[PDB]
């Protein structure tokens with residue numbers, strides 16, 4: 001119902017809008033989203049996450065927000081805040097077609113004044129995540145995918161979408177690329193790993209990162225305490241002017 | 244189109260029909276299917292695989308069968324054989340609603356005389372994999388799922404389906420449960436691992452196995468040479484009368 005100009009006055013308080021996509025599911029898009037929200041929060045920045053993954057909403061579960069309950073004030077629908085860092089989260093999970101539901105998350109929700117709003121788009125490069133791009137129109141987007149699945153095609157299907165909304169591709173994250181034995185510190189690289197840096201150099205992308213399969217990030221993700229995850233794989237993410 | 248009694252004379256040559264299900268995708272259902280077909284083939288047994296995963300058919304790709312091409316003889320639709328071990332494979336992939344397509348794979352295809360016919364059901368415990376059970380009616384089925392997702396509920400949704408077709412639950416496979424550093428041999432167990440043996444003991448299941456995240460099985464799976472994968476995680480699978 002929210003007017004297309006009603007969003008304007010709402011997002012005018014959001015300094016930068018980042019979108020997190022993936023060639024598919026399992027790649028770990030939502031977990032990465034979480035870590036980029038935690039990265040920016042721990043730095044003192046005000047972060048907001050807009051869970052746009054209707055298929056499989058894992059954002060609320062990563063921050064122990066199973067207490068799905070949306071309250072409404074003058075500002076509108078109050079997004080539940082994570083306890084530890086206080087990051088604002090809005091997911092349809094808190095409500096026990098889609099083109100308009102994101103329009104509402106952008107106009108009715110009270111994101112207040114925050115520097116970043118990470119949008120956790122649905123998996124894939126199809127229309128589903130396309131519609132969200134249309135109404136959101138992020139300033140930057142991050143491509144998330146596993147090593148064994150980081151084709152130049154997919155990476156290009158991404159650079160493609162970012163065109164229909166004119167959104168800069170901020171970087172590429174190669175999730176679950178290697179493994180480090182805590183016993184000796186050895187690193188065993190999975191087949192196809194290393195394809196991130198090459199694609200990035202090829203398509204002129206600035207940021208690149210390789211998050212290994214960390215048994216700890218899996219432990220805390222399930223317990224809903226992903227905010228206590230100490231290792232920061234984004235402690236090199238370039239400045240993004242959020243004025 | 245095949246009559247429901249036409250299958251009878253067809254499956255009368257198949258000694259045992261095993262079904263491989265999963266609480267969802269990514270769990271590695273199709274890869275496990277492949278290894279159980281390779282396990283039985285390397286032992287001299289005649290194996291047949293019926294790729295029933297329309298959503299994401301990975302069986303043909305695991306055996307380098309991208310040469311999708313179904314030939315038809317007196318016997319009917321000739322299933323393409325894997326080069327190394329000669330396992331018969333039938334997938335809709337070789338053809339560039341579903342309730343009847345499996346009926347055809349059971350009546351038109353020429354499985355000849357084989358001891359085992361592994362069926363790679365679609366992911367999940369919904370209706371999709373249910374319909375396949377109705378027409379197939381396996382003698383045994385194997386539950387495949389990741390450690391972090393092996394709830395007693397899901398394990399029971401399985402024991403449930405096996406009832407509507409009266410099919411014995413042969414065992415539970417905990418895929419990607421741990422990791423072994425080839426440097427020192429250390430084992431790092433992922434969060435939630437070990438839930439297989441417990442569920443099994445609880446529900447009275449005989450076979451149980453834990454296949455670790457093996458960078459090698461990932462290498463050969465992509466190259467379409469999963470038949471060269473030397474480690475046998477089924478070298479303890481109980482005998483199964485297939486006369």
Ligand SMILES: Nc1ncnc2c1ncn2[C@@H]1O[C@H](COP(=O)(O)OP(=O)(O)O)[C@@H](O)[C@H]1O
Nearest residue numbers: 025026027028029030031176212213214218221
């Ligand atoms: N680096 C990692 N190490 C270990 N487990 C991981 C890692 N990245 C993701 N996971 C786990 O993989 C599963 C899928 O990731 P998820 O973020 O849910 O994917 P997506 O958003 O595409 O559906 C979850 O159990 C998640 O916690």
Ligand SMILES: Nc1ncnc2c1ncn2[C@@H]1O[C@H](COP(=O)(O)OP(=O)(O)O)[C@@H](O)[C@H]1O
Nearest residue numbers: 268269270271272273274419455456457461464
């Ligand atoms: N033990 C393992 N070690 C490494 N990679 C694995 C393992 N099991 C599965 N994989 C990989 O995980 C992905 C998903 O498995 P898949 O069998 O395709 O799942 P599903 O049958 O449920 O669709 C594939 O890339 C597969 O090769």
Ligand SMILES: [Zn+2]
Nearest residue numbers: 181184424427
């Ligand atoms: Zn080691």
